[PDB]
């Protein structure tokens, strides 16, 4: 299914994903299009920060949902 | 009367309200339809964040007005 990931700068990333994809998998798909490593990616949906262990289905993320991507600096 | 609340996900929520409803009442009605706790709701109308102890009438929110909902983490 298709989902959208919006950065805080207004840019929209389109991904192909399955309900059983984990948040980490979703982050790796963002890495394939943008180059952003999963460890710098914070995903939000409906006022909740998404956890790497959980799946899209766990969060009730359905077709054509929008996730919000927040980028973070690398500590080192 | 009917008012509308728009979320930033594109959804419109329709509520049945009266002019004497307080902002808290409105937030509780949003909780009944969406499950969002009042303490995570910020309602925006005419450039203002709406305050809990005031009524729709106080803000001149009339039939078929649209509020915008912002969610806290």
């Amino acid at each position: 299914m298709q989902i959208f990931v919006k950065t805080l700068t207004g840019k929209t990333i389109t991904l192909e994903v399955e309900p059983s994809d984990t948040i980490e998998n979703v982050k790796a798909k963002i890495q394939d299009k943008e180059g952003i490593p999963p460890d710098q990616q914070r995903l939000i949906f409906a006022g909740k920060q998404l956890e790497d262990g959980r799946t899209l289905s766990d969060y009730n993320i359905q077709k054509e949902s929008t996730l919000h991507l927040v980028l973070r600096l690398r500590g080192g | 009367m009917q008012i509308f609340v728009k979320t930033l996900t594109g959804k419109t929520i329709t509520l049945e309200v009266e002019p004497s409803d307080t902002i808290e009442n409105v937030k509780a009605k949003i909780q009944d339809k969406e499950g969002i706790p009042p303490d995570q709701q910020r309602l925006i109308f005419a450039g203002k964040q709406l305050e809990d102890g005031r009524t729709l009438s106080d803000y001149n929110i009339q039939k078929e007005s649209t509020l915008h909902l912002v969610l806290r983490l």
Binding site: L8, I44, G47, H68, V70 | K6, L8, R42, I44, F45, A46, G47, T66, L67, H68, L69, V70, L71, R72, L73
Partner: peptide, 19 residues
Amino acid sequence: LGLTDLELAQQLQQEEYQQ
């Protein structure tokens, strides 16, 4: 106030998401 409420709401949601 036209699009004021939408554009303000979007910016605010965003501020919330940066927290």
